[PDB]
Amino acid sequence: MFENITAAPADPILGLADLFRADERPGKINLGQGVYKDETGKTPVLTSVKKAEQYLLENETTKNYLGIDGIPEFGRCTQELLFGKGSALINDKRARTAQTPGGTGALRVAADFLAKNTSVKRVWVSNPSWPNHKSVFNSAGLEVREYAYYDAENHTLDFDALINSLNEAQAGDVVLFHGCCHNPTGIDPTLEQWQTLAQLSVEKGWLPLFDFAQQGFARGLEEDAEGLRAFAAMHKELIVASSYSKNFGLYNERVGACTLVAADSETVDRAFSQMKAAIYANYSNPPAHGASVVATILSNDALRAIWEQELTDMRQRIQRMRQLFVNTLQEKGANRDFSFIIKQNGMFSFSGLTKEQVLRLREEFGVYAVASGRVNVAGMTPDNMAPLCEAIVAVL
Amino acid sequence: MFENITAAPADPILGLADLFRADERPGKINLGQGVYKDETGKTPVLTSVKKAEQYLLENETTKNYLGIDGIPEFGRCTQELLFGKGSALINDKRARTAQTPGGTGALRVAADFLAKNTSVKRVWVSNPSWPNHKSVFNSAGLEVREYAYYDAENHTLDFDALINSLNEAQAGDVVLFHGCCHNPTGIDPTLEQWQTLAQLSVEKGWLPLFDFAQQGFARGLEEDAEGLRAFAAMHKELIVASSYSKNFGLYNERVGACTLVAADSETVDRAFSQMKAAIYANYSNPPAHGASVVATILSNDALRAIWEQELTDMRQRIQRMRQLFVNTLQEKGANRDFSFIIKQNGMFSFSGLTKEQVLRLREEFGVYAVASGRVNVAGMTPDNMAPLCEAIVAVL
Ligand SMILES: *Cc1c(COP(=O)(O)O)cnc(C)c1O
Ligand SMILES: *Cc1c(COP(=O)(O)O)cnc(C)c1O
């Protein structure tokens, strides 16, 4: 059976990770990873999370199965984070939320649900996008198509080209939007631009699908949801894949959610039952620990306050690195204006380096980035900025 | 899009659970659930698990992603549990193990892997089987077919009928075996019978797929793997879906494994790369906490010793309930000989009650079992045995 199975392609993300480990050079710098890093260069457990875990250690009396859709309070808190306290969506009971193993899990559950219960045949993703999106949808049996997004000249959202491209999208197609902190470009639509896309979406007949991987990393928790909420006000139908991997630092505990919005309670409840069917045939029910940590934090005034400041501290450190990066390149003799980096949002930023410049940065200077030129800004610190920028300037 | 979506069928397992909650009667007895219960009627966290969780609370410094295949030590311990310390399979490096979200997750990952990389078109499951098997394989796009198993007259393994039925299976078909503690019948093959099926499987050309949900609930950890190991000695190719839900009491943390066996290291490593691809497009990587608890326990001499005795205590309490049940029915005037219950293994047992007897037991006497007549023996205690058996005798 397995004699002639074709190997999976190498995978450059794991390859980059392994080449970074083997690199015996002491001044090596990793900007190719997907996780947050602090001023010391590590991915720590949040203080709020540790406190939540201690409480669970002390008060859990059973590990009996969660329901297919997971911890109710988790779903309730997730819906308030996405739509806001006073949302009409929540009030009319139009939204149903499944706890899932991470954002990826939420995308996959969304994909299986649509492929098995709707007429959806294809999904539209940005160019570039996170490469995991394509694989997830393709596995459910959905075609992936690309719409234009990145203006390579101005390091901006090519908005005219984005509209032009999506006009090819038929009614009943899914169109995937990154709620905030676009991966890999860090380029987000403005509110006016979100409102325009919301309007275009309703008349063109798209099912919008929002991927929220970094809620709270752009401007703030509420601000980063504005785009979503603009779509929410316009649309009858909507899906959201959200992740707490980055904003709670719970990557390996697989904490995410799939939220289904329909016109009314009877419809959403009926659609959601088939979404639960898609979860039952996949992993049966979701993992409790990570999601229980999140629900414990968000429903407790003290822990939430502590957590929100931790998230704010991450957001601001990134924003300090963005500026320090631009100023350091400026004063190191930068063959280029990098001021666009400051206007980009969140973990990631397209540096605009060529694949050869990137490959050279690794070979000569021990600086690791992704082939596309994506850099993780959280991998930058005050200590490694000088040598990072010297390397970059030397390859321009 | 969601306007005319057909609702999912009610689901009787959740329906049974909800009807049990609403039941205001004080003497109600639940035998319809899938989880272990102790003498007090609860599903507690194991002492070994709590100790493991405390150690993790104190020593974890990051929640950074696990690899796609999860915690290495977890995989190593899982392979020793399945194949044994000195196994040649482990020595020749023929087995590769992915940590997965529960046994269900392992079945789904197995299913996607086979559907996408082999010529497998159908899977053979026992009659009856756990209904989740059918849904999982059907979602990957695989036909499910049934082979005979249960001898309804003698409450035994209808072995002649089992062989006769599986002769319909073509070469290149998957045949699913329950390693031990068959769900729902509790009827396992003897070693001689396992050796016979192993032999038949190799000449007929089946890819065997083992589902281990209750390793350690029949006779012991090593004993319950004999069937698997008999197949392992004969076969070049094999898949195992194992679960730590029941034997570590970690149900909601989703702790399982998919283990792939091929002829040699180069083949298994190449096949496993595509299995990792199937995980990447599903939930990206597995949840750490539950699997970290398992790895921490199994790799530590003290905690493992404590855990093994906890598992032994569960196995023996079940075996005491089996006997108490038969003796109590005998001395309550049983219209029937229930001695077959004592020879059946693990959590579950087919009582041999009709769906009307079951429905009547719930309506009149507040005793809850599954429509098929499956009873969870761990739901029986010394306190509720008398009233349980009185109800049963009254409906025969
Ligand atoms: C990091 C990231 C995620 C996170 O996925 P999890 O499964 O939640 O770890 C999801 N989507 C995007 C675009 C991301 O960048
Ligand atoms: C209980 C059981 C399982 C457990 O599934 P998890 O996903 O590990 O909870 C798997 N297979 C069978 C036959 C079972 O009875």
Short mmCIF file of N, CA and C in Angstrom, two decimals, chain B residues 310-370:
data_model
loop_
_atom_site.label_atom_id
_atom_site.label_comp_id
_atom_site.label_asym_id
_atom_site.label_seq_id
_atom_site.Cartn_x
_atom_site.Cartn_y
_atom_site.Cartn_z
N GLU B 310 -3.57 2.79 39.42
CA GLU B 310 -4.85 3.45 39.22
C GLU B 310 -5.63 2.75 38.10
N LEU B 311 -4.94 2.41 37.01
CA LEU B 311 -5.55 1.70 35.89
C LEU B 311 -6.00 0.31 36.32
N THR B 312 -5.14 -0.38 37.06
CA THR B 312 -5.47 -1.68 37.63
C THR B 312 -6.71 -1.59 38.54
N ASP B 313 -6.80 -0.53 39.34
CA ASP B 313 -7.97 -0.34 40.21
C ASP B 313 -9.26 -0.17 39.42
N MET B 314 -9.18 0.52 38.28
CA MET B 314 -10.34 0.67 37.41
C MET B 314 -10.73 -0.68 36.80
N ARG B 315 -9.75 -1.40 36.26
CA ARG B 315 -9.99 -2.72 35.65
C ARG B 315 -10.65 -3.69 36.62
N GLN B 316 -10.16 -3.72 37.85
CA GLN B 316 -10.67 -4.66 38.86
C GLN B 316 -12.06 -4.29 39.38
N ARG B 317 -12.35 -2.99 39.48
CA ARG B 317 -13.67 -2.55 39.94
C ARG B 317 -14.72 -2.94 38.92
N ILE B 318 -14.39 -2.77 37.64
CA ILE B 318 -15.26 -3.20 36.55
C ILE B 318 -15.52 -4.70 36.65
N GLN B 319 -14.44 -5.47 36.79
CA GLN B 319 -14.54 -6.93 36.95
C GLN B 319 -15.34 -7.36 38.19
N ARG B 320 -15.32 -6.55 39.25
CA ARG B 320 -16.17 -6.80 40.43
C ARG B 320 -17.63 -6.47 40.15
N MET B 321 -17.88 -5.44 39.35
CA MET B 321 -19.25 -5.08 38.97
C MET B 321 -19.88 -6.13 38.04
N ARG B 322 -19.09 -6.65 37.11
CA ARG B 322 -19.55 -7.72 36.22
C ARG B 322 -20.08 -8.92 37.01
N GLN B 323 -19.32 -9.35 38.01
CA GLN B 323 -19.70 -10.48 38.84
C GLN B 323 -20.88 -10.14 39.75
N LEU B 324 -20.82 -8.99 40.41
CA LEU B 324 -21.90 -8.55 41.30
C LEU B 324 -23.22 -8.46 40.54
N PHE B 325 -23.15 -7.99 39.30
CA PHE B 325 -24.30 -7.86 38.40
C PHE B 325 -24.95 -9.21 38.13
N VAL B 326 -24.14 -10.18 37.72
CA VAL B 326 -24.61 -11.54 37.42
C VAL B 326 -25.21 -12.23 38.66
N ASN B 327 -24.53 -12.11 39.80
CA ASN B 327 -25.00 -12.72 41.05
C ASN B 327 -26.27 -12.07 41.58
N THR B 328 -26.37 -10.75 41.41
CA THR B 328 -27.53 -10.00 41.87
C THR B 328 -28.76 -10.31 41.02
N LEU B 329 -28.57 -10.45 39.71
CA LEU B 329 -29.66 -10.86 38.82
C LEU B 329 -30.11 -12.30 39.13
N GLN B 330 -29.14 -13.18 39.37
CA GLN B 330 -29.41 -14.57 39.76
C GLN B 330 -30.29 -14.65 41.01
N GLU B 331 -29.91 -13.93 42.06
CA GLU B 331 -30.65 -13.96 43.34
C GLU B 331 -31.87 -13.04 43.38
N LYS B 332 -32.13 -12.30 42.29
CA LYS B 332 -33.36 -11.50 42.15
C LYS B 332 -34.42 -12.19 41.28
N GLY B 333 -34.12 -13.41 40.83
CA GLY B 333 -35.06 -14.21 40.03
C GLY B 333 -34.96 -13.94 38.54
N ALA B 334 -33.74 -13.92 38.02
CA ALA B 334 -33.49 -13.57 36.62
C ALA B 334 -34.08 -14.60 35.65
N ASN B 335 -34.93 -14.12 34.75
CA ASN B 335 -35.58 -14.96 33.73
C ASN B 335 -34.61 -15.39 32.62
N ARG B 336 -33.34 -15.59 32.98
CA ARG B 336 -32.27 -15.65 31.99
C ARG B 336 -30.91 -15.87 32.67
N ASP B 337 -29.98 -16.49 31.94
CA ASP B 337 -28.62 -16.70 32.43
C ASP B 337 -27.68 -15.62 31.89
N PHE B 338 -27.15 -14.78 32.78
CA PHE B 338 -26.30 -13.64 32.40
C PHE B 338 -24.80 -13.89 32.61
N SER B 339 -24.40 -15.15 32.72
CA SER B 339 -23.00 -15.51 32.98
C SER B 339 -22.03 -15.07 31.87
N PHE B 340 -22.55 -14.78 30.69
CA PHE B 340 -21.72 -14.30 29.58
C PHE B 340 -21.10 -12.93 29.87
N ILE B 341 -21.77 -12.14 30.73
CA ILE B 341 -21.28 -10.82 31.12
C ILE B 341 -19.90 -10.88 31.77
N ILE B 342 -19.65 -11.92 32.56
CA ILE B 342 -18.38 -12.10 33.27
C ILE B 342 -17.19 -12.34 32.33
N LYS B 343 -17.44 -12.97 31.19
CA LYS B 343 -16.39 -13.26 30.20
C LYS B 343 -16.13 -12.09 29.25
N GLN B 344 -17.02 -11.09 29.25
CA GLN B 344 -16.84 -9.91 28.41
C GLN B 344 -15.91 -8.89 29.08
N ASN B 345 -15.29 -8.05 28.27
CA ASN B 345 -14.17 -7.22 28.71
C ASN B 345 -14.43 -5.71 28.65
N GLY B 346 -14.07 -5.03 29.74
CA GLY B 346 -13.89 -3.58 29.72
C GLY B 346 -15.10 -2.77 30.14
N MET B 347 -15.20 -1.57 29.59
CA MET B 347 -16.25 -0.63 29.97
C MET B 347 -17.64 -1.14 29.62
N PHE B 348 -17.76 -1.74 28.44
CA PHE B 348 -19.06 -2.02 27.84
C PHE B 348 -19.43 -3.49 27.81
N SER B 349 -20.73 -3.73 27.73
CA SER B 349 -21.29 -5.07 27.60
C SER B 349 -22.65 -4.97 26.92
N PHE B 350 -22.88 -5.80 25.91
CA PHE B 350 -24.21 -5.97 25.35
C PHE B 350 -25.03 -6.77 26.35
N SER B 351 -26.03 -6.12 26.95
CA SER B 351 -26.90 -6.78 27.93
C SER B 351 -27.82 -7.81 27.27
N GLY B 352 -28.11 -7.61 25.99
CA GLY B 352 -29.05 -8.45 25.26
C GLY B 352 -30.49 -8.08 25.53
N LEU B 353 -30.72 -6.84 25.96
CA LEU B 353 -32.06 -6.31 26.13
C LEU B 353 -32.55 -5.74 24.80
N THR B 354 -33.85 -5.84 24.55
CA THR B 354 -34.44 -5.31 23.32
C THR B 354 -34.57 -3.80 23.44
N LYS B 355 -34.74 -3.12 22.31
CA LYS B 355 -34.92 -1.67 22.33
C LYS B 355 -36.18 -1.25 23.10
N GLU B 356 -37.18 -2.13 23.13
CA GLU B 356 -38.41 -1.90 23.90
C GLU B 356 -38.17 -2.09 25.40
N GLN B 357 -37.41 -3.12 25.76
CA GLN B 357 -37.01 -3.32 27.16
C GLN B 357 -36.17 -2.14 27.67
N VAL B 358 -35.28 -1.64 26.82
CA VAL B 358 -34.46 -0.47 27.14
C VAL B 358 -35.32 0.79 27.31
N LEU B 359 -36.20 1.03 26.35
CA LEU B 359 -37.12 2.17 26.40
C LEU B 359 -38.04 2.09 27.61
N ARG B 360 -38.43 0.88 28.00
CA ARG B 360 -39.28 0.67 29.16
C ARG B 360 -38.52 0.91 30.47
N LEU B 361 -37.27 0.44 30.51
CA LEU B 361 -36.41 0.65 31.68
C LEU B 361 -36.25 2.14 32.01
N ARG B 362 -36.18 2.97 30.97
CA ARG B 362 -36.04 4.41 31.15
C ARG B 362 -37.35 5.04 31.61
N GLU B 363 -38.44 4.73 30.91
CA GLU B 363 -39.75 5.32 31.20
C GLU B 363 -40.30 4.95 32.58
N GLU B 364 -40.22 3.67 32.94
CA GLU B 364 -40.81 3.17 34.19
C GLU B 364 -39.87 3.25 35.39
N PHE B 365 -38.62 2.82 35.19
CA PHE B 365 -37.69 2.61 36.30
C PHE B 365 -36.51 3.59 36.36
N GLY B 366 -36.44 4.52 35.41
CA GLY B 366 -35.37 5.52 35.40
C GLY B 366 -33.97 4.96 35.16
N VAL B 367 -33.88 3.79 34.53
CA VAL B 367 -32.60 3.20 34.17
C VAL B 367 -32.32 3.49 32.70
N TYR B 368 -31.18 4.12 32.44
CA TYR B 368 -30.83 4.60 31.10
C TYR B 368 -29.75 3.74 30.48
N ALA B 369 -30.06 3.14 29.34
CA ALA B 369 -29.06 2.46 28.51
C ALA B 369 -29.26 2.86 27.06
N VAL B 370 -28.32 2.47 26.21
CA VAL B 370 -28.39 2.77 24.78
C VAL B 370 -29.40 1.83 24.10
#
